Amino acid sequence: ITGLVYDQRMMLHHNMWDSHHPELPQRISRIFSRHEELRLLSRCHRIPARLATEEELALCHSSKHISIIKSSEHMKPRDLNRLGDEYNSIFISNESYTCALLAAGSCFNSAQAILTGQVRNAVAIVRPPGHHAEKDTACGFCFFNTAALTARYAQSITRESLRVLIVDWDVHHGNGTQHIFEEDDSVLYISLHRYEDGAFFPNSEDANYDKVGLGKGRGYNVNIPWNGGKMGDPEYMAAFHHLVMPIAREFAPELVLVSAGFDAARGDPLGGFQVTPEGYAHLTHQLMSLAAGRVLIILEGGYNLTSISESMSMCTSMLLGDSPPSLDHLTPLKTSATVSINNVLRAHAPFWSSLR
Numbered sequence: 432i433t434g435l436v437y438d439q440r441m442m443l444h445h446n447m448w449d450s451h452h453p454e455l456p457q458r459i460s461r462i463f464s465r466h467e468e469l470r471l472l473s474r475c476h477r478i479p480a481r482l483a484t485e486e487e488l489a490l491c492h493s494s495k496h497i498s499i500i501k502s503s504e505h506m507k508p509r510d511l512n513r514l515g516d517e518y519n520s521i522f523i524s525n526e527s528y529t530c531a532l533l534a535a536g537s538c539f540n541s542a543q544a545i546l547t548g549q550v551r552n553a554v555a556i557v558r559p560p561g562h563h564a565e566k567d568t569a570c571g572f573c574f575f576n577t578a579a580l581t582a583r584y585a586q587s588i589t590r591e592s593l594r595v596l597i598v599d600w601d602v603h604h605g606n607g608t609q610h611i612f613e614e615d616d617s618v619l620y621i622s623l624h625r626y627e628d629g630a631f632f633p634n635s636e637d638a639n640y641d642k643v644g645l646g647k648g649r650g651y652n653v654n655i656p657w658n659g660g661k662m663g664d665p666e667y668m669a670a671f672h673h674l675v676m677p678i679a680r681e682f683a684p685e686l687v688l689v690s691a692g693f694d695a696a697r698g699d700p701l702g703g704f705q706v707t708p709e710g711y712a713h714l715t716h717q718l719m720s721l722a723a724g725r726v727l728i729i730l731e732g733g734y735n736l737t738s739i740s741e742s743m744s745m746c747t748s749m750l751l752g753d754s755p756p757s758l759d760h761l762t763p764l765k766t767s768a769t770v771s772i773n774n775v776l777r778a779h780a781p782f783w784s785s786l787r
């Protein structure tokens with residue numbers, strides 16, 4: 432069984448000053464509608480949304496950050512505008528806090544359904560996104576780090592040392608997820624992201640391949656940064672073959688979370704990349720070979736409504752057990768992708784015998 436969570440209340444968060452903002456309420460409704468059109472919704476077990484609690488938010492976030500985001504829901508528009516402007520790339524409305532609580536709680540209910548055996552795997556069609564949010568601050572359309580919180584929630588309902596893999600295929604680096612787990616060997620973070628020598632959002636050298644983790648976490652942070660090329664299916668498939676899957680298999684996760692932005696998709700106006708819906712299906716199907724299939728796909732970014740709807744629907748089709756669609760596997764890689772892959776191999780060979 433595959434679970435699906437979607438709740439139209441998460442559409443209530445919006446940019447009060449721009450009706451054409453990329454992080455649009457219709458992102459989640461279009462994805463949900465496409466699941467109905469492709470006859471996937473009726474095949475899934477519907478998992479209800481719920482609110483995260485403040486104690487659950489404190490698994491990854493500071494009390495001050497929780498209280499400031501909570502305080503926004505009382506503010507008049509002028510004060511919402513001021514507060515949002517204090518962060519990097521954030522808009523806030525009076526519904527934002529509630530929507531962020533529902534995004535996280537939806538994912539907790541999904542992780543619980545997987546870990547208790549009610550479903551094998553699941554998809555969560557949620558907003559606002561999470562992976563840029565830090566312990567102490569909001570960033571990049573994200574208020575609380577839904578995927579990071581879900582990893583800690585999973586440990587909280589099992590054992591502290593439950594091995595959780597987070598694969599982040601959003602086109603942007605999940606700076607918050609990296610930082611939250613940087614010293615932690617129980618949560619392996621693997622991000623693929625457009626980097627451009629630190630020029631691309633979120634504009635930090637923390638996203639480079641030589642950031643391998645700290646302390647006991649050394650080797651448990653895998654950054655795969657792309658420079659120069661318009662990356663697509665062959666480059667992501669090659670990164671999975673040489674890096675993501677060998678490392679993940681050696682880590683032997685007990686739960687896989689996907690920070691599944693669809694902003695690397697063909698058609699995305701921000702990402703500039705060309706991963707196809709069939710490409711995302713192949714990435715999902717590979718991850719399904721891990722953790723006895725216990726995979727939760729969590730929406731992050733993605734800004735072409737057609738692209739994200741087709742891409743995420745293809746991922747759900749794979750979770751349901753459908754045959755992976757045909758792909759032209761032979762295609763030659765862009766030259767800069769091979770350079771990136773080799774840089775990651777050089778940085779991570781000391782930590783992973785599967786790369787030696």
Ligand SMILES: Cc1ccc(NC(=O)CN(Cc2ccc(C(=O)NO)cc2)C(=O)c2ccc(N(C)C)cc2)cc1
Pocket residue numbers: 449451452453520560563571572601603631632692694701731732733
């Ligand atoms: C001079 C200058 C200043 C700032 C920037 N900002 C960036 O570099 C990143 N951001 C914001 C952003 C985009 C996507 C994500 C994300 O979470 N993705 O998953 C997270 C954050 C954008 O570029 C952006 C912002 C607004 C847009 N509107 C209203 C059409 C379009 C693009 C660039 C130059």
Ligand SMILES: [K+]
Pocket residue numbers: 599600601602603604605622623624
């Ligand atoms: K990423």
Ligand SMILES: [K+]
Pocket residue numbers: 612613614615616618619620644648651652
């Ligand atoms: K880590």
Ligand SMILES: [Zn+2]
Pocket residue numbers: 601602603692694731732733
């Ligand atoms: Zn993104």
